[PDB]
Amino acid sequence: GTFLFTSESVGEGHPDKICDQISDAVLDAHLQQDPDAKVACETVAKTGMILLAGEITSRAAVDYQKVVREAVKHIGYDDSSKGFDYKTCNVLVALEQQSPDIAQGVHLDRNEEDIGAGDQGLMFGYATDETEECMPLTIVLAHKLNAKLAELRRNGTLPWLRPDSKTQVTVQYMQDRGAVLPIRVHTIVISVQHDEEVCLDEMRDALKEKVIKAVVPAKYLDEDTIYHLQPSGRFVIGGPQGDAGLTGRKIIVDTYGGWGAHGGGAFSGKDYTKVDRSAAYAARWVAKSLVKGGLCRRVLVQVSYAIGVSHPLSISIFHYGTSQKSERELLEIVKKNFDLRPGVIVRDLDLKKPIYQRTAAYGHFGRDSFPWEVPKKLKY
Amino acid sequence: GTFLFTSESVGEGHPDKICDQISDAVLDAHLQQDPDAKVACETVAKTGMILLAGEITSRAAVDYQKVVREAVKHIGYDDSSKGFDYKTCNVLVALEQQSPDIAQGVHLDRNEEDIGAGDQGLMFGYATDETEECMPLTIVLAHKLNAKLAELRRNGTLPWLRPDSKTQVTVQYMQDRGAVLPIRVHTIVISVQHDEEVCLDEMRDALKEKVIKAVVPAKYLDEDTIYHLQPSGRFVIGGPQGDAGLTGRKIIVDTYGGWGAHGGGAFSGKDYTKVDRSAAYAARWVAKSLVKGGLCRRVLVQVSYAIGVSHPLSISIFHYGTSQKSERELLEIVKKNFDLRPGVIVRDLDLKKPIYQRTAAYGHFGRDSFPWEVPKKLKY
Ligand SMILES: C[S@@+](CC[C@H](N)C(=O)[O-])C[C@H]1O[C@@H](n2cnc3c(N)ncnc32)[C@H](O)[C@@H]1O
Ligand SMILES: C[S@@+](CC[C@H](N)C(=O)[O-])C[C@H]1O[C@@H](n2cnc3c(N)ncnc32)[C@H](O)[C@@H]1O
């Protein structure tokens, strides 16, 4: 009845995550002036470079140099000794207007509620009762380990820490009538960029005592738990210098850590008309509503769209054997309670609000009571 | 007992797919001269630009301008009227050596069989007996629709076609003791870039008669099947001009179309030491071996690694209720038959061979009898 499952997370200074945060800082900057901005901003990061590439049609006047550098400053890359500096890096911009062919097929001369999906695609929502926030324990722990590293870096407890980090948590679970019950942490990995002065043993001791023990409850750790702390042995070169980053390269870290399912679409740098983000947020909202409403213990929701068409093409619900209701019954409850057209999701989830940079590290789900995390009271 | 499932695919000229193909053309160019090249090549594409960003340590002498332009020529972007031209586009290179900190922690002074994983991460393998090639019907049909568009473009049957395309297929399935049985095609979407002269009705008629009917068996199509053909109404602007592309932004199209599971890692532009690719290929090989070996009808395999460590940290197998054997029994069979260290996977799957550009469109799995598609005969 037991099995292992592993999920990973990355820190704010992981190069892919830098890109997601910059893409969302650009989106937020546009939404602060023009709530109806059409934004599709990709970011690429490599040694000394932030490149913005994509399409934006907006009435906002945005200073890309300032927005980008302020996001990098927040992350903590502020000196050439760290491998990257917001003050002196290159910021290159290759942004054009949104394609008029896309604009005419999606939103031009359309009533807001009846705007078409900004692209075709499939999206999933997932929820599990194994935690109060309805998220898998593996991914919650992996995110919290990265957040702890950033906290200790920012408060000066471990001044040798740099912003680039990755974590990985393997949990041993028990199966329970379709639901899953965490038993213990089997393995933890932590890799984090560091300065030239700190030694390996000092880092491994700090990662176990000040990071793992400050995050993971002792009841999950035992004599058999395996620790891989700084397993490469040296991580002085990091951030974009160590590895090129791109927007939308951490989509499993952004969602459920491998649990549930994923349709492939990235979230960051996109306004609400891009259903890769809005419909995944709405699907999470449906999934969490079905679990918090007591209809299932674990649930997966798939939706799909065609570019230019408002209603989803398909809707599917899998309850893993944790509901007394059939999929047909759950679909009827979802039809009575939710409208998954993008032009209605924007109203229900307040998706013109500039809160997107806040979503771009530590996962988009299970945190901070964003609108998609507040369950809808179901009527049936 | 019935449910819907949707998967999508994209064509060779979809901007994200252009990037995957270029990244793998660069990898292959290096492997042709240096089988032990360390390659981590990301590609970004936007109007008039191909940018290579990443890390390569190799003894090869590669002409990036030639390799990139030849890949774009193969795809079909050869004139400014199509929105992109291999002869006249900008090719920018931001490639540095692999970080010496990564090299020392992964492969320097290590016996090949005992090389460490090139990064941490989780990867999944999946197989289903619903098709001979052990792939979901949704994704097989979606890929074949894009391949058909490219065939008709290249043979001059539909000369108004351009290389950028997307497809999406929704199938209605029946559940069968954990396995799934396709019943009918519920919805098909096709969007494809086209010239300024062809009209919408001519395109919709050709897509139904010359593309859908030439790919999807009539037994799956009926009076209720929904068709969304050129649903945006106009798609003249396309390729990188219509939407910025990046390597590793089609990871669900590259794998199982949403079925099974995904660990988040991209495949293209990476040599065998990057377990995001080699361990996902090995996991597919294990999954397909368990189904073709008659041990299960449907199976999911998870593996995970830590950077610098050769053996996987965890291995898990889920058979969806389609095996008489327990997960413990299947894990023992996998342990007796497979060695999932990257330095052994490279030998079993011949991963220094320069065949990677061939994998970078139409999915990495279920095609062409690549080594990971040839089942291993299991001994137990
Ligand atoms: C190992 S790198 C990916 C492979 C790399 N592109 C190469 O050239 O081999 C992926 C991520 O691991 C982390 N990383 C970078 N250098 C590392 C090191 N020396 N030790 C451990 N992790 C490292 C960073 O978070 C980086 O974005
Ligand atoms: C719709 S675009 C993504 C959104 C876009 N970045 C924007 O600015 O709104 C995504 C993919 O859809 C396809 N596409 C581009 N233009 C299109 C059009 N006019 N109609 C339909 N599909 C289109 C291309 O394959 C493209 O890579």
Ligand SMILES: O=c1ccc2n[nH]c(C3CC3)c2n1-c1ccc(OC(F)F)cc1
């Ligand atoms: O539910 C179980 C029970 C036992 C079990 N053993 N291995 C696995 C998975 C290979 C890791 C198991 N899963 C499971 C199945 C799918 C899943 O979500 C996503 F991955 F598709 C998450 C967990």
Ligand SMILES: O=c1ccc2n[nH]c(C3CC3)c2n1-c1ccc(OC(F)F)cc1
């Ligand atoms: O196996 C069933 C049976 C009925 C059913 N209804 N909706 C679904 C899914 C929401 C689409 C169903 N699945 C299913 C579950 C997981 C899965 O792989 C991946 F997505 F996790 C694929 C199919």
